[PDB]
Structure 1
Amino acid sequence: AEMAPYMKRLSRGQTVEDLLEVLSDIDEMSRRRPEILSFFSTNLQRLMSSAEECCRNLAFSLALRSMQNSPSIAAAFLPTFMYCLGSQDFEVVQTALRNLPEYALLCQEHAAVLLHRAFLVGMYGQMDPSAQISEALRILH
C-alpha cells in the first residue's frame, strides 16, 4: 500500500519530468530500507532502455542495487540487459558496458553469453569495450 502511488506514477508516465522526479524520489527512499526495489522490476526493465541519459543511469543504478539486495533475481533482468547491449541507440550500449562488470559478477551463470555479446557488439560495431570486459574477467577469476 505504501508503494502503490509511486508505481502508479511510474507506469503512467510520459514526459521525462515525471519519470526523473519519481526516480529521484525512489532513489532517495531506497537509500534507506533498500528492500523496496523488488516491486520495481518490470517498470525498471522498461525504463532501463529509455533514451534519456539521466533516467537510464538512475534505472541502471537502481537495478544494480536491487541485485545487491538479493542476487537471485539477476536471471530475470537478463533479456533486458541483452537488449540494451544490442540495441541501435548507441547510448544504451555504452551505459550497458559501463555497468557490465558489476552485472557480470552479479549473474555468474550467464556471464558467458553476456561477454560474448559484448565482444560482438564492440567488434562488429566500431567501439572499444576491451577494458570493461577484461576487468570483468580479472575480477571474475
Structure 2
Amino acid sequence: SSRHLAAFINKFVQFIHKYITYNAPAAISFLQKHADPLHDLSFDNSDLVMLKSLLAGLLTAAEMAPYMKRLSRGQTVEDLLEVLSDIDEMSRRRPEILSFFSTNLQRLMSSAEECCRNLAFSLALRSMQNSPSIAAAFLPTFMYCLGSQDFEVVQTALRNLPEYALLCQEHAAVLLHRAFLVGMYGQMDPSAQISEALRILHMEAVM
C-alpha cells in the first residue's frame, strides 16, 4: 500500500536529497549500510520514480501570478471568495504555495466581510503552520484585528488566538495582553481562549 504514503515518500526523498547535499559522506555510509533494502524496494516499488532517480545518482511562483492579481484587484465579495476558495482547494495539495500570498491575504484578515475574513484567517494559520518562521510577520495585522473597531474582526481574532499564540511564543505575551485588554474593556469574554492559549504556552515554556 505505497500509494497512500505518497506525501510521506516525497518528504522522505527530499530529506534524503538534503542529506546527500549537506553531508555526502555520512549519507553514503548510511546507504551502503542499508543498500539491499533500498534495492529490493526499488525493484518491487518501481513506481517510485524519485527512488530510481536516486539510484541513477548512486515554476511554482509563475503559476500563482493570475491568482495574486485577481486577489489584489478584486473588490466584490464574490471575487474574493472565488480566489480564496481556489487557493484553499489547491493549497491542501501544495501547502508551500501559501508563503507567496502572505502579505496579500494579511489585508483580507481585517476585511469586514465574514466569509472572506474567516477563510483568510484559516489560510494564514495553515501557511504559518507549515512555516513557523513567518508567523512573527503576522503580528501587526493580528494585533490590529484584535484592537479594531469592527467587533466581528475582534471575535474571529479571538477565535484563532490559541493557535497563533502557539505559533509565535515570543510575542504571545503582548498578544495575550491585548486579548485580555479588549476583553476587559470591550464586553466580550476571552477567558476561555486566553485560558487554552496560556495553558498550552505554560505547558511548553515552564512546564
Map of 1:89 onto structure 2:
150
Cα deviation code 1:80-127 (max 9, x no counterpart): 000000000000000000000000000011000000000000001111
Write the distance in 2 (CA, Å) between the matches of 1:138 and 1:120: 18
Q: Which runs of 5+ in 2 are unaligned?
A: 1-61, 203-207
Query: Offset at 1:139?
Result: 1.2
Q: Distance in 2 between matches of 1:125 and 1:19?
A: 30
Task: Determine the C-alpha separation between the residues in 1 that align with 2:180 and 2:109.
Answer: 21
Gaps of 5+ in 1: none
Aligned-pair RMSD on alpha carbons? Answer: 0.6
Q: How big is the shift at 1:75?
A: 1.0
Taking the aligned partners of 1:82 and 1:127, their CA distance within structure 2 comes to 16
- Cα displacement (A) at 1:41: 1.0
Q: How far apart are 1:53 and its partner, in Å?
A: 0.6
Higher RCO (CA-CA < 8 Å; seq separation 6+)? 1
Q: Give the number of the structure whose residues are more often helix, by fraction.
A: 2
Tell me the distance in 2 between the aligned counterparts of 1:78 and 1:9: 25
How many residue pairs match? The answer is: 141
Which runs of 4 or more aligned residues in structure 1 lie more than 3 Å from their structure 2 counterparts after TM superposition? Answer: none
Q: Give the C-alpha shift of residue 140 in structure 1.
A: 1.3
Mapping 1:1-141, distance limit 5 Å: 1-141=62-202
Larger radius of gyration: 2
**Partners of 1:68 and 1:116 in 2: CA distance:** 22
